[PDB]
């Protein structure tokens, strides 16, 4: 009894990960997004089968107006749900329907302990520490937008962008989150990136040498993406609000970010 939904996902520590497996058998999944999905499956009484996006991509719009990745899996109706660390953005909202957020998203600073930095303003005033983000990423473009905005109340973001975009972004940016995390652990670099990812990187650091400055900029939300016009989006949203208000979301959050 009950419906089964096909869920497309992408591996993203600690949201979605591969659980125990024997080579050749179907893959199980674990993580914060998986626990949320299980809570919603219990609340709404449905089963689900997970598969990873064939291209391992969240998705982008192609020149022919089609989308790849998970979003493409939703538009093509090959998936009923998409869940991982999907930020709720206008670009995506135009082609798929999102549930209400079950966690907040923002950009934060991975940096070694002991520095006198607590805000992005502070970081923008520093002299001895280089800093940057992933080249040609949504975060990079966010700092581009904020840095070229003359309506900015103060100079913080123009400075941040001046350092980030140095020499076309070659000097101070990295190629992927691993390079930035490790470079910040190396001691003379601050890595600006997703607060959740970076925070997991700090919590699991063996040397306990880094910390996350989360000043809550570029604040969006992680949501569940469904097909446009899906009849389940409202149920998912309401159930998420009720999990948020009952205390379960904070328990799972503390579970995967100990």
PDB file of C-alpha atoms in Angstrom:
ATOM      1  CA  UNK A   1       0.000   0.000   0.000  1.00  0.00           C
ATOM      2  CA  UNK A   2       0.964   3.569  -0.817  1.00  0.00           C
ATOM      3  CA  UNK A   3       2.709   5.234  -3.735  1.00  0.00           C
ATOM      4  CA  UNK A   4       6.383   4.987  -4.637  1.00  0.00           C
ATOM      5  CA  UNK A   5       8.189   8.109  -5.855  1.00  0.00           C
ATOM      6  CA  UNK A   6      11.370   8.163  -7.926  1.00  0.00           C
ATOM      7  CA  UNK A   7      13.956  10.481  -6.358  1.00  0.00           C
ATOM      8  CA  UNK A   8      16.995  11.820  -8.201  1.00  0.00           C
ATOM      9  CA  UNK A   9      19.908  12.983  -6.067  1.00  0.00           C
ATOM     10  CA  UNK A  10      23.562  13.998  -6.059  1.00  0.00           C
ATOM     11  CA  UNK A  11      26.169  12.995  -3.497  1.00  0.00           C
ATOM     12  CA  UNK A  12      26.938  15.954  -1.221  1.00  0.00           C
ATOM     13  CA  UNK A  13      28.481  15.528   2.237  1.00  0.00           C
ATOM     14  CA  UNK A  14      26.648  15.266   4.657  1.00  0.00           C
ATOM     15  CA  UNK A  15      23.334  15.721   2.823  1.00  0.00           C
ATOM     16  CA  UNK A  16      23.463  12.560   0.684  1.00  0.00           C
ATOM     17  CA  UNK A  17      26.057   9.781   0.841  1.00  0.00           C
ATOM     18  CA  UNK A  18      26.357   6.130  -0.148  1.00  0.00           C
ATOM     19  CA  UNK A  19      25.677   3.739   2.735  1.00  0.00           C
ATOM     20  CA  UNK A  20      26.797   0.108   3.142  1.00  0.00           C
ATOM     21  CA  UNK A  21      26.856  -1.845  -0.104  1.00  0.00           C
ATOM     22  CA  UNK A  22      28.024  -5.062  -1.728  1.00  0.00           C
ATOM     23  CA  UNK A  23      29.454  -4.480  -5.197  1.00  0.00           C
ATOM     24  CA  UNK A  24      26.764  -5.308  -7.743  1.00  0.00           C
ATOM     25  CA  UNK A  25      23.763  -4.698  -5.475  1.00  0.00           C
ATOM     26  CA  UNK A  26      21.548  -1.596  -5.355  1.00  0.00           C
ATOM     27  CA  UNK A  27      22.957   1.395  -3.494  1.00  0.00           C
ATOM     28  CA  UNK A  28      21.562   2.664  -0.203  1.00  0.00           C
ATOM     29  CA  UNK A  29      21.831   6.294   0.860  1.00  0.00           C
ATOM     30  CA  UNK A  30      22.262   8.183   4.122  1.00  0.00           C
ATOM     31  CA  UNK A  31      22.586  11.775   5.273  1.00  0.00           C
ATOM     32  CA  UNK A  32      20.615  14.775   6.446  1.00  0.00           C
ATOM     33  CA  UNK A  33      18.548  15.089   3.263  1.00  0.00           C
ATOM     34  CA  UNK A  34      17.898  11.334   3.435  1.00  0.00           C
ATOM     35  CA  UNK A  35      16.651  11.585   7.021  1.00  0.00           C
ATOM     36  CA  UNK A  36      14.395  14.483   6.010  1.00  0.00           C
ATOM     37  CA  UNK A  37      13.122  12.428   3.073  1.00  0.00           C
ATOM     38  CA  UNK A  38      12.418   9.476   5.381  1.00  0.00           C
ATOM     39  CA  UNK A  39      10.538  11.704   7.825  1.00  0.00           C
ATOM     40  CA  UNK A  40       8.417  13.013   4.944  1.00  0.00           C
ATOM     41  CA  UNK A  41       7.866   9.463   3.656  1.00  0.00           C
ATOM     42  CA  UNK A  42       6.583   8.441   7.085  1.00  0.00           C
ATOM     43  CA  UNK A  43       4.435  11.566   7.451  1.00  0.00           C
ATOM     44  CA  UNK A  44       2.889  11.208   3.984  1.00  0.00           C
ATOM     45  CA  UNK A  45       3.008   7.409   3.721  1.00  0.00           C
ATOM     46  CA  UNK A  46       4.972   6.869   0.510  1.00  0.00           C
ATOM     47  CA  UNK A  47       7.896   4.758  -0.663  1.00  0.00           C
ATOM     48  CA  UNK A  48      10.808   5.929  -2.780  1.00  0.00           C
ATOM     49  CA  UNK A  49      13.612   4.684  -5.024  1.00  0.00           C
ATOM     50  CA  UNK A  50      16.754   6.822  -5.294  1.00  0.00           C
ATOM     51  CA  UNK A  51      19.085   7.211  -8.259  1.00  0.00           C
ATOM     52  CA  UNK A  52      21.982   9.569  -8.872  1.00  0.00           C
ATOM     53  CA  UNK A  53      21.695  12.043 -11.723  1.00  0.00           C
ATOM     54  CA  UNK A  54      23.411  10.412 -14.743  1.00  0.00           C
ATOM     55  CA  UNK A  55      25.670  13.474 -15.078  1.00  0.00           C
ATOM     56  CA  UNK A  56      26.139  14.058 -11.344  1.00  0.00           C
ATOM     57  CA  UNK A  57      24.897  17.624 -11.832  1.00  0.00           C
ATOM     58  CA  UNK A  58      22.374  19.772 -10.018  1.00  0.00           C
ATOM     59  CA  UNK A  59      21.576  21.193 -13.456  1.00  0.00           C
ATOM     60  CA  UNK A  60      21.958  24.237 -15.683  1.00  0.00           C
ATOM     61  CA  UNK A  61      20.009  25.599 -18.624  1.00  0.00           C
ATOM     62  CA  UNK A  62      21.592  24.665 -21.945  1.00  0.00           C
ATOM     63  CA  UNK A  63      21.698  26.871 -25.031  1.00  0.00           C
ATOM     64  CA  UNK A  64      18.710  24.944 -26.461  1.00  0.00           C
ATOM     65  CA  UNK A  65      16.514  25.875 -23.427  1.00  0.00           C
ATOM     66  CA  UNK A  66      16.796  22.346 -22.004  1.00  0.00           C
ATOM     67  CA  UNK A  67      18.191  21.608 -18.550  1.00  0.00           C
ATOM     68  CA  UNK A  68      20.702  18.944 -17.567  1.00  0.00           C
ATOM     69  CA  UNK A  69      21.222  17.319 -14.196  1.00  0.00           C
ATOM     70  CA  UNK A  70      18.513  16.820 -11.604  1.00  0.00           C
ATOM     71  CA  UNK A  71      16.429  19.756 -12.836  1.00  0.00           C
ATOM     72  CA  UNK A  72      16.476  18.178 -16.286  1.00  0.00           C
ATOM     73  CA  UNK A  73      15.352  14.917 -14.697  1.00  0.00           C
ATOM     74  CA  UNK A  74      12.372  16.778 -13.215  1.00  0.00           C
ATOM     75  CA  UNK A  75      11.371  18.703 -16.351  1.00  0.00           C
ATOM     76  CA  UNK A  76      11.553  15.500 -18.416  1.00  0.00           C
ATOM     77  CA  UNK A  77       9.366  13.855 -15.724  1.00  0.00           C
ATOM     78  CA  UNK A  78      11.931  11.076 -15.282  1.00  0.00           C
ATOM     79  CA  UNK A  79      11.958  11.942 -11.561  1.00  0.00           C
ATOM     80  CA  UNK A  80       9.197  12.904  -9.148  1.00  0.00           C
ATOM     81  CA  UNK A  81      11.532  14.506  -6.593  1.00  0.00           C
ATOM     82  CA  UNK A  82      15.014  15.970  -6.464  1.00  0.00           C
ATOM     83  CA  UNK A  83      16.777  16.276  -3.111  1.00  0.00           C
ATOM     84  CA  UNK A  84      20.382  16.880  -2.070  1.00  0.00           C
ATOM     85  CA  UNK A  85      21.701  20.372  -1.272  1.00  0.00           C
ATOM     86  CA  UNK A  86      19.531  22.121  -3.857  1.00  0.00           C
ATOM     87  CA  UNK A  87      19.375  25.865  -3.261  1.00  0.00           C
ATOM     88  CA  UNK A  88      16.057  27.562  -4.036  1.00  0.00           C
ATOM     89  CA  UNK A  89      16.985  30.014  -6.786  1.00  0.00           C
ATOM     90  CA  UNK A  90      14.853  32.056  -9.221  1.00  0.00           C
ATOM     91  CA  UNK A  91      16.492  30.382 -12.220  1.00  0.00           C
ATOM     92  CA  UNK A  92      15.391  26.974 -10.917  1.00  0.00           C
ATOM     93  CA  UNK A  93      12.023  28.230  -9.636  1.00  0.00           C
ATOM     94  CA  UNK A  94      11.099  29.158 -13.221  1.00  0.00           C
ATOM     95  CA  UNK A  95      11.089  25.522 -14.400  1.00  0.00           C
ATOM     96  CA  UNK A  96      10.459  23.384 -11.279  1.00  0.00           C
ATOM     97  CA  UNK A  97       8.362  23.752  -8.139  1.00  0.00           C
ATOM     98  CA  UNK A  98      10.159  23.896  -4.788  1.00  0.00           C
ATOM     99  CA  UNK A  99       9.018  22.987  -1.312  1.00  0.00           C
ATOM    100  CA  UNK A 100       9.609  25.396   1.537  1.00  0.00           C
ATOM    101  CA  UNK A 101      13.147  25.263   2.874  1.00  0.00           C
ATOM    102  CA  UNK A 102      14.101  22.611   5.413  1.00  0.00           C
ATOM    103  CA  UNK A 103      17.464  24.278   6.085  1.00  0.00           C
ATOM    104  CA  UNK A 104      19.145  27.623   5.488  1.00  0.00           C
ATOM    105  CA  UNK A 105      21.973  28.237   3.031  1.00  0.00           C
ATOM    106  CA  UNK A 106      24.631  30.947   3.103  1.00  0.00           C
ATOM    107  CA  UNK A 107      28.271  31.677   2.291  1.00  0.00           C
ATOM    108  CA  UNK A 108      30.838  31.510   5.087  1.00  0.00           C
ATOM    109  CA  UNK A 109      34.556  31.762   5.769  1.00  0.00           C
ATOM    110  CA  UNK A 110      36.716  28.722   6.425  1.00  0.00           C
ATOM    111  CA  UNK A 111      39.768  30.033   8.271  1.00  0.00           C
ATOM    112  CA  UNK A 112      42.355  28.848  10.765  1.00  0.00           C
ATOM    113  CA  UNK A 113      41.628  29.431  14.440  1.00  0.00           C
ATOM    114  CA  UNK A 114      43.043  32.369  16.383  1.00  0.00           C
ATOM    115  CA  UNK A 115      42.570  35.102  13.785  1.00  0.00           C
ATOM    116  CA  UNK A 116      40.742  38.294  14.842  1.00  0.00           C
ATOM    117  CA  UNK A 117      38.132  37.785  12.092  1.00  0.00           C
ATOM    118  CA  UNK A 118      34.422  37.444  12.859  1.00  0.00           C
ATOM    119  CA  UNK A 119      32.714  39.088   9.854  1.00  0.00           C
ATOM    120  CA  UNK A 120      33.129  39.548   6.120  1.00  0.00           C
ATOM    121  CA  UNK A 121      33.794  43.212   6.922  1.00  0.00           C
ATOM    122  CA  UNK A 122      36.676  42.170   9.184  1.00  0.00           C
ATOM    123  CA  UNK A 123      38.002  39.865   6.463  1.00  0.00           C
ATOM    124  CA  UNK A 124      37.793  42.713   3.953  1.00  0.00           C
ATOM    125  CA  UNK A 125      39.957  44.810   6.290  1.00  0.00           C
ATOM    126  CA  UNK A 126      42.687  42.175   6.718  1.00  0.00           C
ATOM    127  CA  UNK A 127      46.160  42.692   5.250  1.00  0.00           C
ATOM    128  CA  UNK A 128      48.078  39.445   5.857  1.00  0.00           C
ATOM    129  CA  UNK A 129      45.562  36.813   4.666  1.00  0.00           C
ATOM    130  CA  UNK A 130      44.634  36.006   1.073  1.00  0.00           C
ATOM    131  CA  UNK A 131      41.092  34.787   0.458  1.00  0.00           C
ATOM    132  CA  UNK A 132      38.808  33.664  -2.332  1.00  0.00           C
ATOM    133  CA  UNK A 133      36.320  31.080  -3.548  1.00  0.00           C
ATOM    134  CA  UNK A 134      35.780  28.616  -6.395  1.00  0.00           C
ATOM    135  CA  UNK A 135      36.435  30.168  -9.799  1.00  0.00           C
ATOM    136  CA  UNK A 136      33.362  30.691 -11.986  1.00  0.00           C
ATOM    137  CA  UNK A 137      30.880  29.479  -9.356  1.00  0.00           C
ATOM    138  CA  UNK A 138      27.534  30.843  -8.215  1.00  0.00           C
ATOM    139  CA  UNK A 139      29.384  32.137  -5.140  1.00  0.00           C
ATOM    140  CA  UNK A 140      31.988  33.779  -7.382  1.00  0.00           C
ATOM    141  CA  UNK A 141      29.198  35.480  -9.341  1.00  0.00           C
ATOM    142  CA  UNK A 142      27.505  36.492  -6.088  1.00  0.00           C
ATOM    143  CA  UNK A 143      30.662  38.292  -4.973  1.00  0.00           C
ATOM    144  CA  UNK A 144      30.902  39.761  -8.481  1.00  0.00           C
ATOM    145  CA  UNK A 145      27.384  41.187  -8.191  1.00  0.00           C
ATOM    146  CA  UNK A 146      27.891  42.485  -4.646  1.00  0.00           C
ATOM    147  CA  UNK A 147      31.318  43.908  -5.496  1.00  0.00           C
ATOM    148  CA  UNK A 148      30.153  45.961  -8.493  1.00  0.00           C
ATOM    149  CA  UNK A 149      27.068  47.360  -6.693  1.00  0.00           C
ATOM    150  CA  UNK A 150      27.523  51.131  -6.095  1.00  0.00           C
ATOM    151  CA  UNK A 151      24.442  51.076  -3.815  1.00  0.00           C
ATOM    152  CA  UNK A 152      26.404  49.071  -1.229  1.00  0.00           C
ATOM    153  CA  UNK A 153      26.145  50.604   2.241  1.00  0.00           C
ATOM    154  CA  UNK A 154      29.908  50.212   2.757  1.00  0.00           C
ATOM    155  CA  UNK A 155      33.110  49.122   1.020  1.00  0.00           C
ATOM    156  CA  UNK A 156      33.216  45.528   2.329  1.00  0.00           C
ATOM    157  CA  UNK A 157      32.032  43.791  -0.834  1.00  0.00           C
ATOM    158  CA  UNK A 158      33.959  45.968  -3.292  1.00  0.00           C
ATOM    159  CA  UNK A 159      37.144  45.050  -1.404  1.00  0.00           C
ATOM    160  CA  UNK A 160      36.239  41.368  -1.133  1.00  0.00           C
ATOM    161  CA  UNK A 161      35.682  41.356  -4.897  1.00  0.00           C
ATOM    162  CA  UNK A 162      38.938  43.234  -5.525  1.00  0.00           C
ATOM    163  CA  UNK A 163      40.833  40.419  -3.802  1.00  0.00           C
ATOM    164  CA  UNK A 164      38.666  37.582  -5.150  1.00  0.00           C
ATOM    165  CA  UNK A 165      38.771  38.660  -8.805  1.00  0.00           C
ATOM    166  CA  UNK A 166      42.517  39.412  -8.768  1.00  0.00           C
ATOM    167  CA  UNK A 167      44.030  38.716 -12.193  1.00  0.00           C
ATOM    168  CA  UNK A 168      40.778  37.366 -13.584  1.00  0.00           C
ATOM    169  CA  UNK A 169      40.374  35.248 -10.445  1.00  0.00           C
ATOM    170  CA  UNK A 170      43.515  33.198 -11.086  1.00  0.00           C
ATOM    171  CA  UNK A 171      45.589  34.328  -8.102  1.00  0.00           C
ATOM    172  CA  UNK A 172      43.244  33.922  -5.129  1.00  0.00           C
ATOM    173  CA  UNK A 173      40.515  31.478  -6.203  1.00  0.00           C
ATOM    174  CA  UNK A 174      40.552  27.686  -6.310  1.00  0.00           C
ATOM    175  CA  UNK A 175      39.143  25.098  -8.718  1.00  0.00           C
ATOM    176  CA  UNK A 176      36.928  23.050  -6.374  1.00  0.00           C
ATOM    177  CA  UNK A 177      35.855  23.002  -2.711  1.00  0.00           C
ATOM    178  CA  UNK A 178      38.529  20.452  -1.762  1.00  0.00           C
ATOM    179  CA  UNK A 179      41.342  22.716  -2.976  1.00  0.00           C
ATOM    180  CA  UNK A 180      39.912  25.649  -1.023  1.00  0.00           C
ATOM    181  CA  UNK A 181      39.312  23.657   2.160  1.00  0.00           C
ATOM    182  CA  UNK A 182      42.830  22.218   2.116  1.00  0.00           C
ATOM    183  CA  UNK A 183      44.289  25.611   1.213  1.00  0.00           C
ATOM    184  CA  UNK A 184      42.547  27.161   4.223  1.00  0.00           C
ATOM    185  CA  UNK A 185      43.879  24.351   6.418  1.00  0.00           C
ATOM    186  CA  UNK A 186      47.356  25.146   5.067  1.00  0.00           C
ATOM    187  CA  UNK A 187      47.132  28.277   7.226  1.00  0.00           C
ATOM    188  CA  UNK A 188      47.477  31.293   4.903  1.00  0.00           C
ATOM    189  CA  UNK A 189      44.131  31.298   3.094  1.00  0.00           C
ATOM    190  CA  UNK A 190      40.445  31.884   3.862  1.00  0.00           C
ATOM    191  CA  UNK A 191      37.955  29.913   1.754  1.00  0.00           C
ATOM    192  CA  UNK A 192      34.553  31.492   1.051  1.00  0.00           C
ATOM    193  CA  UNK A 193      31.970  28.797   0.355  1.00  0.00           C
ATOM    194  CA  UNK A 194      28.711  27.103   1.388  1.00  0.00           C
ATOM    195  CA  UNK A 195      28.412  27.293   5.175  1.00  0.00           C
ATOM    196  CA  UNK A 196      27.086  23.731   5.406  1.00  0.00           C
ATOM    197  CA  UNK A 197      29.879  22.112   3.377  1.00  0.00           C
ATOM    198  CA  UNK A 198      32.649  24.174   4.964  1.00  0.00           C
ATOM    199  CA  UNK A 199      31.164  23.591   8.423  1.00  0.00           C
ATOM    200  CA  UNK A 200      31.216  19.837   7.857  1.00  0.00           C
ATOM    201  CA  UNK A 201      34.838  20.183   6.735  1.00  0.00           C
ATOM    202  CA  UNK A 202      35.723  21.955   9.990  1.00  0.00           C
ATOM    203  CA  UNK A 203      33.789  19.562  12.238  1.00  0.00           C
ATOM    204  CA  UNK A 204      35.634  16.572  10.742  1.00  0.00           C
ATOM    205  CA  UNK A 205      39.098  18.162  10.729  1.00  0.00           C
ATOM    206  CA  UNK A 206      41.538  15.836  12.487  1.00  0.00           C
ATOM    207  CA  UNK A 207      43.835  18.684  13.554  1.00  0.00           C
ATOM    208  CA  UNK A 208      40.867  20.854  14.637  1.00  0.00           C
ATOM    209  CA  UNK A 209      42.722  23.759  13.040  1.00  0.00           C
ATOM    210  CA  UNK A 210      39.889  25.563  11.210  1.00  0.00           C
ATOM    211  CA  UNK A 211      36.625  27.294  12.072  1.00  0.00           C
ATOM    212  CA  UNK A 212      33.684  28.752  10.154  1.00  0.00           C
ATOM    213  CA  UNK A 213      32.742  32.431  10.217  1.00  0.00           C
ATOM    214  CA  UNK A 214      29.098  32.349   9.130  1.00  0.00           C
ATOM    215  CA  UNK A 215      27.966  35.951   8.638  1.00  0.00           C
ATOM    216  CA  UNK A 216      24.745  34.965   6.825  1.00  0.00           C
ATOM    217  CA  UNK A 217      25.282  36.528   3.396  1.00  0.00           C
ATOM    218  CA  UNK A 218      23.852  35.116   0.173  1.00  0.00           C
ATOM    219  CA  UNK A 219      21.218  33.625   2.462  1.00  0.00           C
ATOM    220  CA  UNK A 220      18.941  31.235   0.582  1.00  0.00           C
ATOM    221  CA  UNK A 221      17.339  27.921   1.513  1.00  0.00           C
ATOM    222  CA  UNK A 222      17.750  24.271   0.659  1.00  0.00           C
ATOM    223  CA  UNK A 223      14.502  22.852  -0.681  1.00  0.00           C
ATOM    224  CA  UNK A 224      13.018  19.790  -2.307  1.00  0.00           C
ATOM    225  CA  UNK A 225      12.444  20.265  -6.030  1.00  0.00           C
ATOM    226  CA  UNK A 226       9.415  18.703  -7.706  1.00  0.00           C
ATOM    227  CA  UNK A 227       7.971  18.719 -11.201  1.00  0.00           C
ATOM    228  CA  UNK A 228       6.279  21.914 -12.304  1.00  0.00           C
ATOM    229  CA  UNK A 229       2.645  21.717 -11.254  1.00  0.00           C
ATOM    230  CA  UNK A 230       3.253  18.777  -8.933  1.00  0.00           C
ATOM    231  CA  UNK A 231       0.267  17.967  -6.671  1.00  0.00           C
ATOM    232  CA  UNK A 232       2.602  16.973  -3.804  1.00  0.00           C
ATOM    233  CA  UNK A 233       4.579  20.213  -3.405  1.00  0.00           C
ATOM    234  CA  UNK A 234       2.106  21.768  -0.962  1.00  0.00           C
ATOM    235  CA  UNK A 235       2.020  18.613   1.176  1.00  0.00           C
ATOM    236  CA  UNK A 236       5.824  18.471   1.265  1.00  0.00           C
ATOM    237  CA  UNK A 237       5.971  22.160   2.199  1.00  0.00           C
ATOM    238  CA  UNK A 238       3.451  21.860   5.034  1.00  0.00           C
ATOM    239  CA  UNK A 239       5.051  18.682   6.399  1.00  0.00           C
ATOM    240  CA  UNK A 240       8.436  20.427   6.326  1.00  0.00           C
ATOM    241  CA  UNK A 241       7.053  23.407   8.241  1.00  0.00           C
ATOM    242  CA  UNK A 242       5.629  21.001  10.823  1.00  0.00           C
ATOM    243  CA  UNK A 243       8.949  19.166  11.197  1.00  0.00           C
ATOM    244  CA  UNK A 244      10.643  22.555  11.580  1.00  0.00           C
ATOM    245  CA  UNK A 245       8.150  23.524  14.298  1.00  0.00           C
ATOM    246  CA  UNK A 246       8.175  20.167  16.123  1.00  0.00           C
ATOM    247  CA  UNK A 247      11.946  20.116  16.733  1.00  0.00           C
ATOM    248  CA  UNK A 248      12.880  17.182  14.485  1.00  0.00           C
ATOM    249  CA  UNK A 249      14.770  19.255  11.908  1.00  0.00           C
ATOM    250  CA  UNK A 250      17.089  20.629  14.592  1.00  0.00           C
ATOM    251  CA  UNK A 251      17.710  17.104  15.896  1.00  0.00           C
ATOM    252  CA  UNK A 252      18.684  15.839  12.433  1.00  0.00           C
ATOM    253  CA  UNK A 253      20.766  18.974  11.811  1.00  0.00           C
ATOM    254  CA  UNK A 254      22.674  18.347  15.042  1.00  0.00           C
ATOM    255  CA  UNK A 255      22.923  14.698  13.970  1.00  0.00           C
ATOM    256  CA  UNK A 256      24.816  15.426  10.751  1.00  0.00           C
ATOM    257  CA  UNK A 257      26.633  18.564  11.980  1.00  0.00           C
ATOM    258  CA  UNK A 258      27.713  17.342  15.447  1.00  0.00           C
TER     259      UNK A 258
END
